[PDB]
Symmetry: D4
């Protein structure tokens, strides 16, 4: 800490999130933020992103938590290093609030 | 740390805050930000929000600190887990400053 | 940590900052951000602000560091509690950069 | 921690970043953020910036990581004190994402 | 044209807008913008605003058009002069769009 | 002029725009803004939007001008009234510029 | 129309505006925007600005309208050409609204 | 009016602007906005931009007015159609103001 940190800021993707008739019939915007630690050539982050986009847009999700976890797993699938954190914002998910997000991390 | 963190970003509510004639006669805008830890189906955050909105709009407050605490308590009332942090911004409360906020946390 | 934290966000003040002919002849904008810890009625933050504004606008400064320190001291002058942090932004102080800031803290 | 922290916020520079025909033929925007610790007259940060700008604009880079490191080194070249952190954002480097950044730090 | 123009920018009010179960059970945010012409002491705009706020918050609306018209009328009720324009934004009323607004004007 | 104006602000849609290998293989973000005049119940703008979204997402475009025109036509297809203007932004289409847009209008 | 138009965007000045005890004891922020037409060497706009700043900061105002007019006059005092428009925003002058402004123009 | 309008929004370029020692030794940021009318395949706007960028970055300017005119001329050099408007912002050119711009148009 700190050392080698790569950040993917505000990756905006559209997919199905929710179970409600409208949520299942229409795609919505969700915002992904990725923090990857890998101390200390590198075609990496591009592939990780590619995979996360592909997985997110080509699927249906019932719960931000499942989506976040799936992404997190995708992030540790290829490298073994070192620490990964994923926050997923569902913009305007609550009345009167700008967003609601779920963050998950791993070693 | 980090693990399971849910964030409720910029929940904008209107209520009475202050003792001043104008503050008691007219509602004002206040901005709430909630950080909840709950390692590691979940109809939870929706209910918590519902309760915090309902409590905030349906009452009168004399001091940001009382409001923040009341919210914090509301956040730990239902689950026992795990860590909760509440920041409340009173926008343009001071001359020349964008905001003033009070943050409180608990185990 | 975390517990009782009060934040004063983007207090914009105008004063003389610098030694350069233009800096001494003309006031400039500077942005102050204050973090105060005081675990766990309170006419406090209003007075602190009052004093910091009054001190900043009614003086001349040769160096962000002196200004920041003076504010920090003003913050610990009245209460003994508990932790205080002061960041001062000199907007557009460097070519091509949004700002330059100095942060100082105390126990 | 915290103590003496100087921040250089959003230093926007244009240079060549990448190997792709377009990346080598045309300069791009990159955003640098510098955090310097130096507890506890000072013509310093101005010179550091000067050197980082000069080095960045007067060169070609094949990889954000090389650019970030080069800057970091430039930051510790003159003083011995104390801690330095450099984040470099390549705006709109990924499709659908606001930015991608690399952060590096040192003692 | 141009001459005497007063603008009330982004008046944010909460009221009931819509017929849908959720729209009738819960208040929503709406943003009002007023342009008043009165060529060429004046306690006016304050009263107009007062009346528009009071009318908007103390009622229920079935359609942006009715709300906008009601405001417009309120604007010409007191003075006879000279030209008035009212835009009402229903933020995030459409999927994927920042807002939808209705503008109405009068002589 | 002015009278009855409805505005659809920043309708963000993703579709294929361009002929370039990357433009044809990957969808991009485009921002639509609609101005409709209809002097002086109304399930209208919702349907218009529905149709414009459906047409935009379910097709491929070779040129902003074709896309803009197609939308404009969709806007006059249902009502006969009265004036319609459509601006389409292709964000970050040019190096160093925030956007490029095409606007078209009709009677 | 259009031809030679110079714009001075968001000139932020602090002065006394109002009659209320607080308004007379404390300076406030006001935002000035100037549009000057002069079809078709020029040390002009710098001097105009200089004079408007000097006049605004070195005086007390009872009413946005007086302030706006005084500025407008200052703008036509030196050149005879050609058209001038002045908007003055009093930020957060009304509850729930971002600003209130007064615009005045001349030949 | 309105009909075929293409807009190039916030083209940010760096060049030498001014006569002052610092202005001649160091490049600065300037923001260009182009409005082109051409009622009613088109490799046009790309070339126009290319030429305006190339001309702006590969030269030195003594006065926003000369720069704006040079761009305007570049815009009418290739097509004969139809109306062109060019605004050039010199960000933070005046103390306390966000920008100063010069606009010029032609038939």
């Amino acid at each position: 800490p700190g050392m080698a940190r790569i950040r993917v800021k505000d990756l905006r993707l559209r997919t199905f999130i929710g179970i409600k008739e409208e949520e299942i019939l229409n795609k919505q915007d969700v915002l992904i933020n990725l923090t990857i630690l890998y101390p200390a050539h590198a075609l990496n982050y591009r592939t990780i992103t590619k995979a996360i986009i592909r997985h997110v847009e080509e699927n249906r999700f019932a719960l931000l938590e499942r989506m976040t976890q799936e992404i997190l797993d995708l992030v540790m699938e290829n490298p073994a290093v070192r620490y990964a954190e994923v926050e997923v914002d569902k913009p305007h998910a609550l009345r009167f609030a700008e967003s609601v997000s779920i963050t998950l991390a791993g070693h």
